[PDB]
Design a protein around this ligand. Structure first.
Ligand SMILES: OC[C@H]1O[C@@H](O)[C@H](O)[C@@H](O)[C@@H]1O
Ligand SMILES: OC[C@H]1O[C@@H](O)[C@H](O)[C@@H](O)[C@@H]1O
Ligand SMILES: OC[C@H]1O[C@H](O)[C@H](O)[C@@H](O)[C@@H]1O
Ligand SMILES: Cc1ccc(S(N)(=O)=O)cc1
Ligand SMILES: Cc1ccc(S(N)(=O)=O)cc1
Ligand SMILES: [Zn+2]
Length: 257
């Protein structure tokens, strides 16, 4: 029943998900001047060469590209992380206009969209158990700005017409998520939460400093998706982002000096 409209959006979520007002909610504004270099961070390792994508799903909130997470095929390690985190899915948040869409902000600046690559800590066996743990998840967040096209995004763009409405899915095998990364892995990190209900406080956030560029045409196709199901009145899937939440008793650490 939650969503992004005036009547069911982020300002309403706390009534069914009281952790929405919790001590480690996401997203947050990243104040780049206050973030501190952390020499204790180990090198970050994004190891996606054996990733196995399976399917793309319109879940009524965003679209998820799902991966085979039945073994360590595509993993995130290092940086702030203790152990191995397995890629389960990625999705985006985006705006109705290029001037908004990201969840995290950088010195209050909003990007056109934000990519979330979602991983779970293998020590907990399954995603469901991982979301009962303070260190259960790691989300790699990547900002999107509008400029030149991102070649590695085009396959995603081109399948969206087949999953226009809530509940539709399509095969999405042999997709390489490495094509969605920027050149640099410089990042900020902090402890937070899922940014959608159930808002669980299980996430180590790793937000890359360098945005990727996508073309206007690519993001315009995101904005043709529908929140509604087939045959229902059309509600464009736009502005599916939660605003920044209070930082509370947290510090953002930087991987770079
Ligand atoms: O097909 C997408 C990707 O799938 C992975 O399993 C392969 O190891 C990569 O070489 C390939 O780019
Ligand atoms: O007490 C000093 C310590 O304060 C903490 O809040 C900072 O995260 C550390 O980087 C610093 O060394
Ligand atoms: O890699 C993701 C998808 O890209 C394109 O849609 C290909 O036609 C399809 O075979 C593949 O599953
Ligand atoms: C009608 C309705 C409105 C909002 C929600 S919430 N608290 O899940 O956002 C649920 C039902
Ligand atoms: C189930 C779930 C997974 C990941 C997220 S996010 N937007 O915090 O990456 C939210 C919900
Ligand atoms: Zn997300």
């Amino acid at each position: 029943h939650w969503g992004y409209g005036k009547h069911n959006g982020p300002e309403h979520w706390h009534k069914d998900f009281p952790i929405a007002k919790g001590e480690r909610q996401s997203p947050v504004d990243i104040d780049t001047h206050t973030a501190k270099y952390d020499p204790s961070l180990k090198p970050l390792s994004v190891s996606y060469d054996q990733a196995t994508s399976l399917r793309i799903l319109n879940n009524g909130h965003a679209f998820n590209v799902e991966f085979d997470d039945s073994q360590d095929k595509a993993v995130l390690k290092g940086g702030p992380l203790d152990g191995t985190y397995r890629l389960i899915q990625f999705h985006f948040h985006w705006g109705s206009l290029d001037g908004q869409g990201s969840e995290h902000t950088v010195d209050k600046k909003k990007y056109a969209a934000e990519l979330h690559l979602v991983h779970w800590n293998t020590k907990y066996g399954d995603f469901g158990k991982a979301v009962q743990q303070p260190d259960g998840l790691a989300v790699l967040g990547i900002f999107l700005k509008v400029g030149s096209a991102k070649p590695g995004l085009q396959k995603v763009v081109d399948v969206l017409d087949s999953i226009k409405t809530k509940g539709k899915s399509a095969d999405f095998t042999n997709f390489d998520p490495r094509g969605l990364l920027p050149e640099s892995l410089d990042y900020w990190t902090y402890p937070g939460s899922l940014t959608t209900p159930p808002l669980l406080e299980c996430v180590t956030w790793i937000v890359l400093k360098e945005p990727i560029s996508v073309s206007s045409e690519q993001v315009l196709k995101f904005r043709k998706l529908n929140f509604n199901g087939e045959g229902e009145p059309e509600e464009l899937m736009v502005d599916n982002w939660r605003p920044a939440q209070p930082l509370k008793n947290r510090q953002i650490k930087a991987s770079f000096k």
